[PDB]
Amino acid sequence: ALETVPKDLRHLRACLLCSLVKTIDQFEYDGCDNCDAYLQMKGNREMVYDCTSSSFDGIIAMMSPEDSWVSKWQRVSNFKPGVYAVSVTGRLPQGIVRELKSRGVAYKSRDTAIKT
Amino acid sequence: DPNLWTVKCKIGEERATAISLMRKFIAYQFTDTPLQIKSVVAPEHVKGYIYVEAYKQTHVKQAIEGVGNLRLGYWNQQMVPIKEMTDVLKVVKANLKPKSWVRLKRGIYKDDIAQVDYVEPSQNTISLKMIPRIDYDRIKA
Ligand SMILES: [Zn+2]
C-alpha cells in the first residue's frame, strides 16, 4: 500500500518487533501496520519514541514474504510487505516486554548484526 | 530461492533509486506490466552499485527498464554464487548509543576520541565529552 512507503527520507526510524521503516509522521498518524493491538503506537509520540528507535542499519523492499529467501531468514514472512530493516539495535525496557509474553507475542531480538 | 543481481548507479543516488523502485512496484502491481522482483537490498556500507533480487536475468531487465538511475549498467547483470546470499546481510559494529566512544569530523578536536553523555530525542544535536586545548587566551592575540 501507499502507507508503508516512507514519504520523506528525513526523520526515519525502525521498530524492534517487525522492523518497520517509516517516517516519524507515519508512526504517529498510522503506527505499526504489523502490530496495532499489542503495541498501540497510533495517536501519540511517547510510545513511538519509547519502543521504536532510530538506531538501525540497512533497508529491504519486502514485496512477497510468502515466497522469498530473505523473508524466511529474518523471520518476517508473517508480516505485511514493505520497508523493513536487517539490523535494529537496542532493547525494549522492562515495562512493555512483560505484557507481551502474557498475550502470546514472543519479543525477539531482531538485531542480527554481529558484535566485534 | 530468488537470485541476487548487481547493478551500477551514480555515487550517492542509491537512496532515491531505492524509494522510487518501491513506488514503481506499487505503481505497477495492478497493471498489465507488473514487477517480478521480490526485494531490493541496499546496504549502508557499499558504494557505486546495488542489489536486485529476482528468479531470472530477464526479469530484472524488464523491470529496471525506464529508470534513469540504472540505465548505465543496464547491459550487464553480474551475479553472485549461492554462498553470498548470507554475507550481504552481515553488519559489523545505527551507531547511536550513550556512554559510548565517538570521534569528531570537523572543528578543532579533529580525530580526537570523545564520549557521549546525553542524546536529544529531536535528532538535531548530541552531547559530547571532550577536553579543551585552547591557551586560555595567553598565546593568541
Ligand atoms: Zn513490528
Curated annotation (Swiss-Prot), chain A:
Question: Quick one: where's region Interaction with SUPT5H?
Answer: 1-39
List the InterPro entries: RPABC4/Spt4, Spt4, Spt4/RpoE2_Znf, Spt4_sf
Q: Which Gene Ontology cellular-component terms appear in the entry?
A: DSIF complex; nucleoplasm; nucleus
Maturation and modification: Ubiquitinated by UBR5 when not assembled in the DSIF complex, leading to its degradation: UBR5 recognizes and binds a degron that is not accessible when SUPT4H1 is part of the DSIF complex.
Give the UniProt keywords, A-Z. Answer: Acetylation, Activator, Metal-binding, Nucleus, Repressor, Transcription, Transcription regulation, Ubl conjugation, Zinc, Zinc-finger
Q: One GO biological process from the UniProt record?
A: regulation of transcription elongation by RNA polymerase II
Q: Where does Zn(2+) bind?
A: 15, 18, 32, 35
Q: Which domain of life is it from?
A: Eukaryota
Residues bearing PTM N-acetylalanine? 1
Does the UniProt entry include the keyword Cell membrane? no
Tissue and organ distribution:
Widely expressed.
List the molecular function annotations (GO) for this entry. Answer: protein heterodimerization activity; RNA polymerase II complex binding; zinc ion binding
User: Where, per UniProt, does this protein localize?
Assistant: Nucleus
ZnF endpoints (C4-type): 15-35
UniProt lists the family membership as follows: Belongs to the SPT4 family.
Q: Which PANTHER family match?
A: SUPPRESSOR OF TY 4 (PTHR12882), TRANSCRIPTION ELONGATION FACTOR SPT4 (PTHR12882:SF1)
Fill in the subunit field for this protein.
Interacts with SUPT5H to form DSIF. DSIF interacts with the positive transcription elongation factor b complex (P-TEFb complex), which is composed of CDK9 and cyclin-T (CCNT1 or CCNT2). DSIF interacts with RNA polymerase II (Pol II); forms DNA and RNA clamps that stabilize Pol II elongation complex while maintaining the nontemplate DNA strand in the transcription bubble and nascent RNA in the exit channel. This interaction is reduced by phosphorylation of the C-terminal domain (CTD) of POLR2A by P-TEFb.
Record function comment: Component of the DRB sensitivity-inducing factor complex (DSIF complex), which regulates mRNA processing and transcription elongation by RNA polymerase II. DSIF positively regulates mRNA capping by stimulating the mRNA guanylyltransferase activity of RNGTT/CAP1A. DSIF also acts cooperatively with the negative elongation factor complex (NELF complex) to enhance transcriptional pausing at sites proximal to the promoter. Transcriptional pausing may facilitate the assembly of an elongation competent RNA polymerase II complex.
Question: What is the protein's given name?
Answer: Transcription elongation factor SPT4
Lineage, broadest ranks: Eukaryota, Metazoa, Chordata, Craniata, Vertebrata
Name the gene behind this protein. SUPT4H1
UniProtKB/Swiss-Prot annotation, chain B:
Transmembrane residue ranges: none
Protein localization: Nucleus
Which post-translational modifications are recorded for this protein? Answer: Methylated by PRMT1/HRMT1L2 and PRMT5/SKB1. Methylation negatively regulates interaction with P-TEFb and RNA polymerase II. Phosphorylated by CDK7 and CDK9. Phosphorylation by P-TEFb (CDK9) at Thr residues of the C-terminal repeats alleviates transcriptional pausing and promotes transcription elongation. Dephosphorylated by the INTAC complex when transcripts are unfavorably configured for transcriptional elongation, leading to premature transcription termination: dephosphorylation is mediated by the PPP2CA component of the INTAC complex. Dephosphorylated by the PNUTS-PP1 complex in termination zones downstream of poly(A) sites, thereby promoting deceleration of RNA polymerase II transcription.
| Residue ranges, annotated region (Interaction with SUPT4H1) | 1-93
Q: In which tissues is it expressed?
A: Ubiquitously expressed.
* Result when mutating residue 76 to A: Reduces the affinity for Pol II elongation complex
Q: Where is the KOW domain?
A: 96-129
What is the top-level taxon of the source organism?
Eukaryota
Hey, which family's this protein in? Belongs to the SPT5 family.
Its annotated function is as follows: Component of the DRB sensitivity-inducing factor complex (DSIF complex), which regulates mRNA processing and transcription elongation by RNA polymerase II. DSIF positively regulates mRNA capping by stimulating the mRNA guanylyltransferase activity of RNGTT/CAP1A. DSIF also acts cooperatively with the negative elongation factor complex (NELF complex) to enhance transcriptional pausing at sites proximal to the promoter. Transcriptional pausing may facilitate the assembly of an elongation competent RNA polymerase II complex.
Quaternary structure, from the entry:
Interacts with SUPT4H1 to form DSIF. DSIF interacts with the positive transcription elongation factor b complex (P-TEFb complex), which is composed of CDK9 and cyclin-T (CCNT1 or CCNT2). DSIF interacts with RNA polymerase II (Pol II); forms DNA and RNA clamps that stabilize Pol II elongation complex while maintaining the nontemplate DNA strand in the transcription bubble and nascent RNA in the exit channel. This interaction is reduced by phosphorylation of the C-terminal domain (CTD) of POLR2A by P-TEFb.
What this protein is called in its record is Transcription elongation factor SPT5
Q: Which organism is it from?
A: Homo sapiens (Human)
Taxonomy, top ranks, is:
Eukaryota, Metazoa, Chordata, Craniata, Vertebrata
Full protein stretch here:
176 to 318 of 1087
